[PDB]
Design an enzyme around this catalytic site. Sequence first.
Site, short mmCIF file in Angstrom:
data_model
loop_
_atom_site.label_atom_id
_atom_site.label_comp_id
_atom_site.label_asym_id
_atom_site.label_seq_id
_atom_site.Cartn_x
_atom_site.Cartn_y
_atom_site.Cartn_z
N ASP A 1 0.81 -1.22 0.00
CA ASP A 1 0.00 0.00 0.00
C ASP A 1 0.84 1.27 0.00
O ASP A 1 1.26 1.77 1.06
CB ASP A 1 -0.89 -0.03 1.23
CG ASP A 1 -1.96 1.00 1.22
OD1 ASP A 1 -1.93 1.89 0.34
OD2 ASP A 1 -2.81 0.94 2.12
N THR A 2 1.08 1.84 -1.18
CA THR A 2 1.92 3.03 -1.29
C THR A 2 1.24 4.25 -0.69
O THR A 2 1.91 5.24 -0.41
CB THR A 2 2.31 3.30 -2.74
OG1 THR A 2 1.14 3.45 -3.54
CG2 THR A 2 3.17 2.20 -3.32
N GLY A 3 -0.07 4.20 -0.49
CA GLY A 3 -0.81 5.29 0.15
C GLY A 3 -0.82 5.25 1.66
O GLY A 3 -1.43 6.12 2.30
#
Lengths: 99, 99
Positions: free
Chosen positions: B25-27
């Site tokens: 999850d880059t967010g």
Amino acid sequence: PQITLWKRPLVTIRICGQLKEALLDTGADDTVIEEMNCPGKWKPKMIGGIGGFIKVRQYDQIIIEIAGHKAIGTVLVGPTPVNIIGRNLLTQIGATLNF
Amino acid sequence: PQITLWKRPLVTIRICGQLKEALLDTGADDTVIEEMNCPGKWKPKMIGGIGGFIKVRQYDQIIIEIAGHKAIGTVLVGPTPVNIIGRNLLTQIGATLNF
Ligand SMILES: CC(C)CN(C[C@@H](O)[C@H](Cc1ccccc1)NC(=O)O[C@H]1CO[C@H]2OCC[C@H]21)S(=O)(=O)c1ccc(N)cc1
């Protein structure tokens, strides 16, 4: 480009004629944009994450430019604390995660 | 590997002995895992996502294998809807976004 993840992966987007900053988010199925008065028909939707759900307006076939790359698809608009580019549009700009 | 985004970027992790599925999850700034038994000391913290804030237990310096890659760092344990691997550990395994 290559974006390292030391900092939030923020890029400039254009949606409904407005420039905004948005987070490239592999953990988001769908793109969610902060409240704004976009024209067009929509359907209500509830989306859930940490903390629970928010109510959003689902717009289909919305054109967005993301870091200079054109995209078109579903955009959810509502009281999100950040603008999030989710996988539905990340795939359209050719984004991959590499390690 | 190179991971495209047509599907959720799910991987197997090992954390505190146990195998779990988690989402890259880059967010997410931080790594957040569902309630589970981990040994040792923890600190109460809060974290906020799209729908509001939740209470979590912060464990530091936890050894965690992510798709066969080693990381050792902070994990927040609490009532998240999805196990998420955030940037604090994505950076350790050398992940970047590319398009
Ligand atoms: C929890 C995930 C499965 C899904 N989320 C995307 C996720 O990347 C959010 C995206 C995000 C980012 C900032 C604020 C709210 C949501 N990050 C997040 O919750 O991270 C938390 C853990 O680290 C902290 O850093 C950021 C918030 C904390 S989500 O925002 O809830 C979400 C859910 C559905 C859609 N369509 C779009 C987004």
